[PDB]
Design a protein around this ligand. Structure first.
Ligand SMILES: Cc1cc2nc3c(=O)[nH]c(=O)nc-3n(C[C@H](O)[C@H](O)[C@H](O)COP(=O)(O)OP(=O)(O)OC[C@H]3O[C@@H](n4cnc5c(N)ncnc54)[C@H](O)[C@@H]3O)c2cc1C
Ligand SMILES: Cc1cc2nc3c(=O)[nH]c(=O)nc-3n(C[C@H](O)[C@H](O)[C@H](O)COP(=O)(O)OP(=O)(O)OC[C@H]3O[C@@H](n4cnc5c(N)ncnc54)[C@H](O)[C@@H]3O)c2cc1C
Ligand SMILES: NC(=O)c1ccc[n+]([C@@H]2O[C@H](COP(=O)([O-])OP(=O)(O)OC[C@H]3O[C@@H](n4cnc5c(N)ncnc54)[C@H](O)[C@@H]3O)[C@@H](O)[C@H]2O)c1
Ligand SMILES: NC(=O)c1ccc[n+]([C@@H]2O[C@H](COP(=O)([O-])OP(=O)(O)OC[C@H]3O[C@@H](n4cnc5c(N)ncnc54)[C@H](O)[C@@H]3O)[C@@H](O)[C@H]2O)c1
Ligand SMILES: COCCOCCOCCOc1ccc(C(C)(C)CC(C)(C)C)cc1
Ligand SMILES: COCCOCCOCCOc1ccc(C(C)(C)CC(C)(C)C)cc1
Ligand SMILES: COCCOCCOCCOc1ccc(C(C)(C)CC(C)(C)C)cc1
Ligand SMILES: COCCOCCOCCOc1ccc(C(C)(C)CC(C)(C)C)cc1
Ligand SMILES: COCCOCCOCCOc1ccc(C(C)(C)CC(C)(C)C)cc1
Ligand SMILES: COCCOCCOCCOc1ccc(C(C)(C)CC(C)(C)C)cc1
Ligand SMILES: [Mg+2]
Ligand SMILES: [Mg+2]
Ligand SMILES: [Mg+2]
Ligand SMILES: [Mg+2]
Ligand SMILES: [Mg+2]
Ligand SMILES: [Mg+2]
Ligand SMILES: [Mg+2]
Ligand SMILES: [Mg+2]
Lengths: 493, 492
């Protein structure tokens, strides 16, 4: 008779919600086709053999018994439909048997998938890099190619075509995967495959001018410089537009007329995100959202358009559409002293609990001061703040923070003295890191920039050994680096 | 213009030959469809998640440069034919492209495969345990089943049938794989799957009366006792005769007409050896060996029936057929009045020619004979010949053969010792087995281990020395810490 919370997904959102939700207060079931949590930041290290599967993983069933003594459940299913009207979901097991399950609360955390842009042959020929098996598939293919090119039944020009590694995407994923392959190629591969080492080349391809565009221009320039010193072909300002079995095509971003055909052996696709079929389906089911491209939620992470307000979504599968300021103008006016921008800002602490977009991290009050306004003008101003609101970026950092917010809201606000005092979710940006090869780490932190150096790696390791969610994983983190330092990357495939 | 040695296979034989063969003296190429060496004794620990792949493995290319500066080569191919007349072999890559290669010496070390005994459904439905991939497939299937049986769309009756693990074979492989699963089931699985744990059962099936037949009766009895304490169904004196998708059939060894149909979820097949298709093919190519079931070699490991004497075989793919004593009677008489004790007295030196004369191959005291006539001596010699047993198909023997033969190439073949090449004689060092719940058994010369608090410690001290790199020793040590402090993983 405890209320049932179903969690869909075992990713950063779902798993972290699981870790914090009170199993005494609720009856909790996580549902996911994947029986482990994947620690995605270390996924590129898996591509090169620097770290093991154990450090990139947490098994869900190890976290189903909290110290209180009460338990949670886990089912290995893939949710295929949500029926918000009747409070249930349809799933399928791995043998396509339907399973029907009821909930009182649904926490959707199914994440996003890799975007092919409908380009011909991305699904067919390219390797994605979004989970454990993806990374392992990529490692093996690479090692497979190395062995195939050591055979005598092969010409030097066949070798040059096949030993070309193309990475599409100059975001952090693409950049880190390239970096890691570069280290592998310049170390272990160089030693054990000398006769063919010089036919090997890596290219990274990016539509815009900069690698790591969302970081900072100095970090971008440094990343490109460092890539040059590693003899990585940096093909920025190029868009991949077609993919065939042995070659792909690129179009210059600077001249629409300039195309190139490139040979390749291994093609890694690390472009942006796209929605799961479950989300596409679910959207059609909600009158208000029937033609949305992504699932929209409250400022409280409630899925808009559900009469019951019993479905939440966290992580990559959702954008936040908060309660509009300009729909509550008069009410906000009463709350104030004047009627200036800094009248508003003076009450920004209190009003931020209701409107996230009022946050000093969401609205620049100084780049936008406004002298005394008439009510209508104030309403226009409020409207600008509304339009300026940016939904949290699709990162593990945000998914984790959303997961702790929401679970704590279930633990401490719903079904307690505070049912109505629930604050709206606001991220704190903690910074971003990236490995860019050859011991060089970059970090774009709130008050710092790292641009390489002897102690860059050290900073990276102190950061991530603390972001790991178990002592088991910390053990492996430590051991795996010793092993890689003393003995090297492995060639088992 | 260095002579070319081609090694076929990257197992205990091939890899250890590679480790010791002098790359300065020869131009060596190992050919194997598998680019790593598999440390098979720890393979059952891989089934249960106790140890990792890193401790069961060595990557061939890490060993292609010895410290003197000379190199070896490796090619990822599967040999499909040997043409002994013309000294070349045909291979195929993984995309079925033919490759043709010339050698001066061929070292065949392709091992053996699992024997299905042609039984319907073994290949189709059963899991084998001969390599890394096998162990991981086995591990996954089990975890798959546990998850499937936690679903609601499943009856307790379906659960009981699906969560039955049957292991066919009471040899050390079968026994060790059963033990490891028992440990996993009784620890990590019991904690994380309380609801369905009592639907789980393990059976081991063995045709003879004993588990670990080739050990000791005390060790066999102790292994069976320990198995019952763990609630493993020990179905000795049963053999499997048929296999279907959800059930298999067994026949009593004690009553020809008692049969049983058993349901199962996971069927593991560890029944003993059979020959590779390469060896079957190659045999038909050798006139004197054309109807053999197994490849026979000299007492010097040279494949018999080859005019050039440039093809060797080591490991599980071969049996030794030594030079016959009774074909050399008169000569032996001349070396030596004319008793078994006379013969034994010269046994150390004659053993360099005939391995069957070894005190480890022939019981001189249980077979003493007084003065013989030449004819009688000839008959005696003949008994020694027929008593000879080829090395048992073990890693221990494949390794010892590989060190012997590589040492012959290094220090005999192109030196002034060409003619004093001694015949190969194993030295048995003992055998160990993990039998679950921390109990190790060992059947050593002069000792028997039957369990104990310090049983496991002995096992760990032995195998950390048997590992062939410091890398692997690191992982050996670390993997046991990991398993102790944090437990076995459920990743699949
Ligand atoms: C290589 C890589 C490196 C990254 N590094 C960083 C980083 O350093 N910092 C950072 O902030 N972010 C990083 N990210 C981004 C981060 O992984 C995502 O933002 C994060 O995964 C969002 O979490 P999520 O729970 O929404 O989705 P996921 O973590 O992808 O989880 C989705 C889960 O839903 C499951 N699922 C899918 N379909 C269904 C279905 N219909 N039913 C039930 N379950 C389903 C999946 O199995 C999965 O378990 C990285 C991403 C990648 C790919
Ligand atoms: C689970 C298990 C545990 C064991 N434990 C022990 C133990 O504790 N002690 C002990 O003494 N023995 C043990 N053994 C036995 C030991 O593994 C074998 O006796 C040993 O492998 C024999 O070595 P080999 O080189 O002849 O064959 P393998 O080690 O099997 O090597 C054969 C190699 O040949 C390759 N190959 C196959 N076909 C071809 C082809 N056509 N062309 C080229 N290469 C080919 C294979 O890929 C493989 O690399 C165990 C065996 C198993 C399965
Ligand atoms: N180290 C970190 O902190 C880290 C690491 C990985 C991911 N993340 C987060 O995960 C999310 C996704 O990251 P991501 O790297 O996979 O995607 P991304 O959107 O950040 O980068 C994709 C890049 O590929 C380009 N692109 C798209 N289609 C292309 C084409 N056809 N040809 C060439 N270039 C093309 C885009 O211009 C874009 O710059 C991001 O929000 C990111 O911040 C963070
Ligand atoms: N711990 C160790 O030292 C160790 C471990 C594994 C293997 N080995 C060596 O590797 C070789 C192979 O060992 P193995 O265990 O794989 O095979 P095995 O030959 O030693 O034993 C197989 C057993 O299964 C039985 N069997 C065969 N077909 C059957 C059927 N249809 N139904 C029921 N029982 C059936 C046989 O009676 C036999 O005892 C051996 O030489 C062994 O010594 C040693
Ligand atoms: C599960 C969440 O764990 C909280 C993270 O807190 C810590 C604390 C200490 C550490 C170590 C001991 C690794 C700190 C260090 C880097 C100073 C040794 C790591 C994480
Ligand atoms: C249950 C046991 O959990 C304790 C694990 O605690 C640690 C402590 C340190 C470490 C690293 C961080 C430093 C220490 C080391 C060397 C033991 C891996 C790993 C795990
Ligand atoms: C790359 C090779 O580095 C080998 C060392 O591996 C590590 C991993 C983590 C650490 C940290 C920074 C966590 C050390 C610690 C945890 C004791 C502070 C140190 C070394
Ligand atoms: C490769 C051949 O290696 C020979 C094995 O020799 C040793 C020596 C010591 C050891 C250690 C010290 C790791 C184990 C010990 C000393 C506890 C027996 C292991 C193997
Ligand atoms: C560089 C070559 O590395 C040598 C590795 O030497 C060892 C020594 C001891 C060990 C044990 C078995 C003691 C594990 C250890 C070192 C973690 C204690 C492993 C490797
Ligand atoms: C607890 C299990 O962890 C281990 C693993 C290996 C070892 C041995 C004994 C093999 C290593 C050695 C040589 C240091 C004793 C000891 C404990
Ligand atoms: Mg999730
Ligand atoms: Mg994840
Ligand atoms: Mg999500
Ligand atoms: Mg996602
Ligand atoms: Mg071999
Ligand atoms: Mg082997
Ligand atoms: Mg062999
Ligand atoms: Mg074999």
């Amino acid at each position: 008779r405890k209320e049932k919370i179903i969690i869909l997904g075992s990713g950063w959102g779902g798993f972290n919600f699981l870790l914090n939700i009170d199993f005494k207060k609720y009856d909790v079931t996580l549902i996911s086709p994947r029986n482990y949590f994947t620690f995605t930041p270390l996924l590129p290290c898996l591509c090169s053999g620097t770290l093991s599967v154990n450090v990139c993983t947490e098994s869900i069933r190890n976290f189903l018994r909290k110290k209180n003594g009460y338990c949670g459940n886990y089912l290995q299913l893939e949710c295929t439909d949500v029926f918000y009207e009747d409070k249930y979901i349809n799933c399928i097991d791995i043998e396509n048997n339907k399973v029907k399950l009821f909930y009182d609360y649904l926490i959707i955390a199914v994440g996003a998938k890799t975007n092919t842009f409908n380009i011909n042959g991305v699904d067919k020929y390219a390797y994605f890099v979004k989970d454990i098996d993806d990374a392992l598939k990529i490692r093996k293919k690479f090692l497979d190619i190395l062995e195939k090119c050591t055979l005598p039944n092969i010409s030097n020009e066949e070798k040059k075509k096949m030993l070309h590694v193309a990475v599409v995407g100059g975001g952090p994923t693409g950049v880190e995967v390239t970096a890691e392959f570069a280290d592998f190629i310049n170390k272990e591969v160089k030693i054990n495959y000398k006769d063919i080492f010089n036919f090997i080349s890596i290219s990274i391809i990016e539509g815009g001018n900069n690698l790591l565009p969302t970081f900072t221009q100095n970090i971008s320039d440094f990343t490109k410089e460092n890539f040059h010193n590693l003899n990585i072909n940096v093909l920025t300002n190029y868009y991949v537009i077609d993919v065939d079995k042995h070659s792909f095509h690129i179009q210059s971003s600077l001249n629409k007329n300039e195309k190139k055909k490139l040979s390749y052996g291994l093609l890694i696709w690390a472009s942006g995100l796209a929605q799961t079929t479950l989300i596409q389906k679910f959207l059609k089911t909600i009158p208000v959202q029937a033609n949305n491209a992504i699932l929209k939620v409250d400022e409280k992470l409630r899925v808009i358009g559900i009469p019951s307000n019993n479905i939440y979504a966290i992580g990559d599968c959702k954008k936040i559409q908060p309660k509009l300021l300009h729909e509550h103008t008069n009410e906000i006016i009463k709350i104030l002293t004047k009627l200036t921008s800094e009248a508003l800002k003076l009450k920004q602490s209190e009003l931020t609990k209701t409107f996230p977009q009022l946050s000093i991290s969401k609205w620049d009050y100084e780049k936008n001061k406004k002298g005394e306004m008439t009510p209508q003008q104030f309403h226009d101003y409020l409207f600008e703040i509304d339009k300026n609101y940016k939904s949290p970026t699709p990162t593990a950092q945000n998914a984790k923070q959303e997961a702790y917010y929401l679970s704590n809201v279930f633990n401490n606000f719903i079904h307690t003295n505070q049912k109505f005092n629930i604050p709206s979710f606001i991220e704190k940006w903690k910074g971003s890191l990236a490995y860019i090869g050859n011991h060089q780490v970059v970090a774009d932190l709130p008050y710092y920039e790292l641009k390489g150096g002897r102690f860059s790696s050290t900073f990276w390791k102190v950061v991530y050994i603390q972001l790991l969610l178990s002592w088991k994983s910390r053990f492996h983190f430590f051991i795996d680096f010793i092993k890689t330092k003393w003995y090297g990357r492995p060639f088992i495939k």
